[PDB]
């Protein structure tokens, strides 16, 4: 037995804390590094000597995706030669080494390592459609930081942590643990909230210290190094005296893993088996659909939030309170809602809560934005305007999708990898979480920009986003529903 109120409030045995608290620390370190790196790259590329920030979009398009595929191929290669632990260390140490060499060797030696300006005539030797490659190669080290800062969350959190969790957690145990790991994300959000503001405060020396980004960057980067080394120590501890405890991983199944399976294929062989598996393309669709929908339902919503609040002081107050309650709602949903929905209803319900909600409360949102004029005769007789009503309804879909990401979406999705063979639990996971996720947060910007030129104005593409969302949610719901048939079947094969 487990209990009556505890089987619903805290479904963790007291002995199986030694497996989950180290994973909480791992998630904490990863998310802390990710938040610090994001907020230091978006703050470091504003203040290069001269216009060293204009070459952000050239990076965003020409390096971010391409370097994501390069990392993905290199990871696929190293998965065949290195062990699981060796691969984890060999992916993590380059990040920490770059974060150590940046403030010591790389950033201070800007004017010496950036193109000896001689790569200035090289601008006008190449066709006038690759001026960015000159700007990218001119802001060379800053380019290496934006890629390694964007990739960190895609690499460490999605591929490395979850790929480690999905290798060391059973499905029934996943239903109880995976929802909880975003509490580490929220606690790391508090830690980063203190750390980043500490760095910004210490950015004060103007005269005796002329370099503003010397000391602050060195301390932020050393903080990321300390967090990454604590990450690696957590990995070592959980591999040395967690996967070795006989309580879990019953004795004879232990040496089935230190003597276990491993990705054994070739680069084109592996990326032709993954491209012709209906399972992986469905996971790719979920991540692509989630990437665009959450971005589209957020740019559509953070356009009414700008019409309702045309002054940043209260927009910061609403988004200061929204960012505070998306932490409270996403500590209760993680502790209480997420693990319970997946255990009393099933896998499918957990994967369909957030798209159905985004659908139902997105239908309401778009019906109050498209039909704004012929709705302020009824809504106006209830004490509110349809703009405020779309703000609140759109906040619910942005507080039941951001508070559902780690709890039900990232739980059910990374649970889906568990019954898989190694070639997609490791190498397909790279494509889904590093490459097939880049098209998510970039495909929502392309759809926005591609429709900001077909409609011209942001207010005219709302009827076109709605049909786009209704199709992506359609392909999301069918992908989630068709995936459930494969998951519940492939899971059944694991009881051989």
């Amino acid at each position: 037995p487990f209990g009556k109120l505890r089987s619903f409030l805290w479904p963790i045995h007291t002995h199986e804390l030694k497996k989950v608290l180290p994973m909480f620390l791992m998630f904490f370190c990863i998310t802390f590094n990710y938040t610090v790196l994001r907020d230091t790259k978006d703050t470091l590329i504003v203040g290069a000597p001269g216009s060293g920030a204009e070459a952000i979009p050239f990076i965003k398009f020409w390096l971010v995706v391409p370097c994501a595929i390069i990392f993905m191929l290199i990871y696929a290669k190293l998965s065949n030669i290195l062990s699981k632990q060796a691969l984890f260390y060999a992916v993590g140490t380059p990040f920490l080494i770059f974060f150590a060499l940046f403030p010591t060797v790389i950033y201070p030696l800007r004017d010496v390592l950036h193109p000896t300006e001689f790569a200035d005539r090289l601008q006008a030797i190449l066709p006038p459609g690759l001026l960015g490659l000159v700007a990218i190669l001119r802001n060379w080290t800053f380019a290496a930081f934006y890629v390694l800062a964007e990739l960190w969350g895609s690499v460490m959190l999605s591929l490395m942590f979850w790929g480690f969790a999905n290798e060391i957690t059973k499905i029934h145990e996943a239903k109880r643990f995976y929802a909880l790991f975003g509490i580490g994300a929220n606690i790391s959000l508090l830690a980063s909230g203190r750390a980043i503001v500490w760095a910004s405060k210490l950015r004060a020396s103007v005269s005796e210290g002329v370099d503003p980004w010397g000391i602050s960057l060195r301390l932020l980067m050393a903080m990321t190094i300390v967090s990454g080394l604590v990450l690696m120590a957590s990995y070592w501890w959980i591999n040395k005296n967690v996967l070795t405890d006989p309580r879990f991983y019953n004795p004879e199944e232990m040496q089935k893993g230190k003597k276990g399976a491993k990705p054994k294929m070739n680069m084109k062989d592996s990326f032709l088996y993954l491209a012709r598996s209906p399972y992986i393309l469905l996971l790719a669709l979920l991540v692509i659909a989630y990437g665009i929908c959450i971005n589209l339902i957020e740019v559509t919503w953070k356009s009414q939030l700008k019409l309702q609040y045309p002054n940043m002081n209260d927009y910061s107050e609403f988004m200061g309170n929204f960012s505070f309650w998306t932490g409270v709602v996403s500590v209760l949903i993680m502790l209480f809602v997420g693990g319970n929905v997946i255990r009393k209803f099933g896998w499918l319900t957990g994967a369909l809560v957030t798209p159905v909600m985004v659908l139902l409360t997105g239908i309401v949102f778009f019906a109050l934005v498209i039909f704004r004029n012929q709705a302020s005769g009824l809504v106006a007789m209830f004490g509110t305007t349809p703009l405020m009503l779309a703000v609140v309804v759109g906040a619910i879909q942005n507080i039941l999708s951001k508070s559902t990401k780690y709890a039900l979406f990232d739980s059910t999705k990374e649970m889906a990898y568990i019954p898989l063979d190694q070639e997609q639990k490791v190498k397909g996971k790279a494509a889904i979480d590093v490459v097939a996720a880049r098209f998510g947060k970039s495909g929502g910007a392309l759809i926005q920009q591609g429709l900001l030129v077909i409609c011209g104005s942001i207010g005219a593409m709302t009827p076109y986003l709605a049909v786009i969302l209704l199709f992506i949610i359609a392909i999301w719901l069918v992908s989630a529903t068709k995936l459930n048939k494969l998951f519940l079947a492939q899971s059944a094969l694991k009881e051989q």
Partner: nanobody
Framework: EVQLVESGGGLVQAGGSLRLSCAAS????????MGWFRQAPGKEREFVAT????????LYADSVKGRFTISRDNSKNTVYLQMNSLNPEDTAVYYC???????????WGQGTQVTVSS
Amino acid sequence: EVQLVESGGGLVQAGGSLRLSCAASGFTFSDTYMGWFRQAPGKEREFVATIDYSGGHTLYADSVKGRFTISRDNSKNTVYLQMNSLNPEDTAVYYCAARKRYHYYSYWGQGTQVTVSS
């Protein structure tokens, strides 16, 4: 039965004023949600003012903010509407409105003609 007798209509110069009225009978005015719409000939109907169950919440349309002030008195049961600084596009049939405490539709009114001249 639930008739809403309007009043106050007439011709007034630009920058003038006229004050509507909506006699309410057939329900509990103290717990009935009031308002005022308007429908110019040719264009659809838009809401112009709104007053809550207890006179506290006053929601207006962005085209009549500051100029029009809705006010209701439960004793002398009427959802008044004080219009000031009238501009020519306020020419319409200013419908009264009424909603019960848990109903989702509105008992409309006959309609008062407010032609603001130029």
